């Protein structure tokens, strides 16, 4: 009671360390100890004058209750940070890199002038590094004084230093047991003539030598540099003593925490063989591949020396399993015009077997959409993938008569992927699709496509039909180097997909799509990121035909341009007069009909286009109010999205009065804030976006909620 800054959790753990725990005995002699300890903690933070006094009240049956009355004061603030003896640099420049702040600018309201002993020690280390990286090689902190105003709210800091002279590196001399890699080490100890000494460079050189040795199995070498200083001409000669040691071999590779995933699922991602000489680079590659898999929340490695053995180690990968799946589900009608239901099951690691299984569909009175997809990422040991997909979509309008826009489609697809590098992988497959449209409302784009196919449907009556069986060859290429599998903080992923109708199909065309997502971290902790995402698409017919209008690209939504209604960006339909197949009392018929006018009046129904290009720039920031324990389960970002869809075949010569949909200039834009949460039902994305740039017919939708990975 009384503590306003130190949480009860940290206090409670501090209690157990001293033996004070519920159910145990009360060691009275330790009371003073604990009290003093807590006070010391309050003094480390700078909260001098704080008191922590313990009260023991006797409860019956020989029991006690321990109440720790905290009375914290006002935290002291650093009044000054002074460096005495700095003649080469200036106090302002030196302390600008300090964690402790002497003063805070009025604009900066995220930092304070609070004191901490550990921060002071790190600050002294930073100053020492600053002076040693400029070639002084003699910088010494003579003393450090931390003072305090008599009112105990004015802490002061002072550092007395001696810069010494500036030295230059005469040359690095490396000697010892180099294990035959001397030639490759001389290239790591190359120095420019007359270059100034630099401590961080020497440390990096030592680390590079250690890493170079480790790549050949020398897991435990010793590298020490003892620079010999010569003040006669102010030159320092480095002396790197290296002892490679013994070459280590891996005995067993063990996996812990994979309570669901199969053992082979983790082993198949290993570049380090079990009964072979160790390679640290191979172990790191295996860890990175496991991280990129996306099946595990966290992955760690531990190389443990085998007891009683100077040559063998055990590599242990410790993983934390993650919920790899989404369960999108909803009901739209309930009791209006019948009943409806939806399914969204999607698993990336089905029962820990590594299979990717996704089944989703929608059953309505007018729709019977069903889709199944099963892919084995490892159909061969090397990583050859074998996928498959079945889909069946139906549109009947639940009328069983004419003038209903019947559209029944169904198709199959088989894919086969295989790697070519550690990051690149190609894909080839065969797909079949059957599409049967009937009773189509006349429109300029759809009728143009139908004419391109050689059909001549009437422009007035809705009576019409069209059947097409298409066999397509699908190809693809994925380059994946992302840091992680679900919330990347580095690296880029590029996915190219395409299809071409092989001769013999009803309609000839080709289509290609290209995604891209690049994560660039600005913070060393990878907590602030910049995400540049883009998507491109182009399709067209091969012979005298045209790309089918059901393969068109759609933009706008929670996946392409947030802030717009789904599949709303792009060309809008233009309807011809009907003069037949009109329902006067329905009132749902469009402008161009018997009940309405008899011109090509433009509607607001999005039809998509055969060319698409969308980009997006995102800034990933830490969630403002969330415990760091759940930091990786939620992501907050500020996004600016751009997008456009146009129909390259739109004839501007005709329909001059109507908008020209072949112009890619009309670029929609939006900006807003998005939040992604890894809930039990998979990823949930909330986003609020304002579309400050929009064109006629664009239906805006500021708030959007989505289930499952957007992209």
């Amino acid at each position: 009671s009384g503590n306003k800054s130190v949480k009860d959790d940290m206090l409670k753990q501090n209690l157990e360390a001293s033996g004070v725990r519920v159910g145990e005995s009360l060691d009275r002699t330790t009371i003073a100890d604990i009290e003093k300890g807590l006070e010391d903690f309050y003094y480390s933070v700078g909260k001098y004058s704080a008191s922590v006094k313990a009260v023991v009240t006797p409860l019956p049956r020989n029991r006690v209750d321990l109440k720790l009355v905290f009375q914290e004061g006002v935290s002291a603030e650093i009044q000054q940070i002074n460096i005495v003896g700095n003649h080469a640099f200036t106090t302002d420049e030196l302390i600008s890199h300090f964690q402790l702040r002497d003063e805070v600018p009025w604009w900066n309201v995220v930092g304070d002038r609070k004191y901490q002993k550990q921060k002071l020690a790190g600050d002294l280390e930073t100053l020492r590094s600053y002076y040693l990286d400029r070639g002084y090689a003699r910088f010494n902190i003579d003393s450090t004084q931390v003072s305090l105003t008599p009112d105990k709210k004015g802490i002061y800091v002072t550092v007395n230093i001696t810069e010494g002279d500036q030295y230059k590196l005469s040359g690095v001399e490396v000697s010892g047991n180099l294990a035959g890699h001397s030639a490759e080490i001389e290239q790591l100890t190359k120095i420019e003539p007359g270059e100034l000494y630099n401590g961080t460079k020497v440390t990096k050189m030592e680390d590079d030598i250690k890493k170079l040795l480790g790549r050949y199995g020398y897991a435990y070498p010793r590298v020490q540099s003892m620079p010999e200083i010569n003040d006669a001409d102010k030159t320092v000669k480095l002396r790197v003593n290296v002892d490679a040691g013994n070459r280590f071999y891996v005995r067993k590779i063990r996996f812990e925490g994979n309570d669901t995933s199969k053992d082979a699922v983790l082993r198949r991602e290993m570049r380090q063989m079990e009964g072979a000489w160790l390679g640290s680079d191979l172990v790191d590659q295996g860890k990175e591949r496991l991280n990129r898999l996306g099946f595990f929340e966290t992955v760690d490695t531990d190389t443990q020396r085998v007891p009683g053995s100077p040559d063998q180690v055990d590599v242990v990968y410790k993983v934390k399993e993650r919920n790899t799946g989404s369960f999108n589900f909803g009901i739209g009608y309930g009791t209006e015009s019948g009943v409806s239901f939806q399914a969204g099951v999607q698993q990336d690691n089905w029962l820990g077997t590594g299979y990717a299984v996704g089944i989703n569909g929608t059953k309505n009175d007018y729709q019977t959409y069903a889709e199944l997809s099963v892919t084995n990422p490892y159909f061969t040991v090397d990583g050859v993938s074998l996928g498959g997909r079945l889909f069946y979509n139906d549109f009947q309008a639940d009328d069983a008569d004419l003038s209903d826009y019947t559209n029944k489609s169904y198709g199959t697809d088989v894919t086969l992927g295989f790697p070519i590098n550690e990051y690149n992988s190609l894909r080839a497959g065969l797909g079949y699709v059957h599409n049967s449209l009937s009773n189509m409302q006349p429109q300029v784009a759809m009728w143009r496509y139908l004419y391109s196919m050689g059909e001549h449907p009437s422009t007035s009556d809705q009576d019409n039909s069209f059947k097409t069986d298409d066999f397509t060859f699908n190809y693809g290429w994925t380059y994946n180097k992302l840091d992680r599998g679900y919330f990347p903080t580095d690296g880029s992923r590029v996915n190219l997909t395409g299809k071409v109708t092989i001769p013999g199909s009803d309609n000839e065309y080709y289509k290609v799509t290209l995604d891209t997502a690049t994560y660039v971290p600005i913070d060393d902790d990878h907590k602030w990121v910049v995400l540049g995402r883009t998507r491109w698409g182009y399709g067209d017919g091969l012979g005298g035909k045209e790309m089918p209008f059901y393969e068109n690209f759609y933009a706008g939504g929670s996946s392409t341009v947030r802030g717009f209604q789904s599949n709303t960006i792009g060309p809008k339909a233009v309807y011809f007069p009907h003069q037949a197949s009109n329902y006067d009392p329905d009132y749902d018929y469009e402008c161009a009909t018997q009940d309405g006018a008899k011109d090509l009046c433009k509607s607001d129904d999005a039809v998509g286009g055969n060319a698409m290009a969308v980009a997006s720039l995102e800034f990933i920031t830490p969630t403002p109010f969330i415990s760091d324990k759940y930091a990786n389960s939620v992501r907050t970002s500020f996004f600016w999205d751009m997008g456009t869809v146009w129909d390259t075949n739109w004839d501007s010569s005709q329909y001059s009065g109507y908008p020209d949909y072949s112009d890619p200039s009309n670029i929609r834009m939006s900006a807003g804030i998005a939040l992604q949460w890894m809930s039990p039902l998979g990823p949930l994305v909330f986003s609020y976006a304002q579309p400050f740039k929009k064109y006629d017919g664009d239906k805006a939708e500021q708030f959007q909620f989505n289930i499952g990975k957007t992209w």
Partner: protein
């Protein structure tokens, strides 16, 4: 095949010409282990034999193996060296 990328499958323990030449008959087991390192493969049945196998399979390039069999007596004194430089 021949186009699917396959990583290098290194198997066994590293052997070098100098290291193999550093071992001669009459050497004790501890001396052999010091010279060449602890073997990754012995004979679990009734024989005191050490197998130093050196496999490398770069992937679509052929597998090369050098196998050095060291037979000791009951006392642990090296008795026979059998060096096979390449596969048959």
């Amino acid at each position: 095949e021949r186009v699917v990328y396959r990583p290098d499958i290194n198997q066994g323990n590293y052997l070098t010409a100098n290291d193999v030449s550093k071992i001669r008959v009459g050497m004790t087991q501890q001396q052999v282990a010091y010279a060449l390192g602890t073997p990754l493969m012995s004979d679990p049945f009734g024989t005191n034999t050490w197998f130093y196998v050196f496999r490398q399979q770069p992937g679509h390039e052929g597998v090369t193996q050098q196998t050095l069999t060291l037979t000791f007596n009951s006392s642990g004194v090296l008795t026979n060296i059998d060096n096979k430089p390449a596969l048959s």
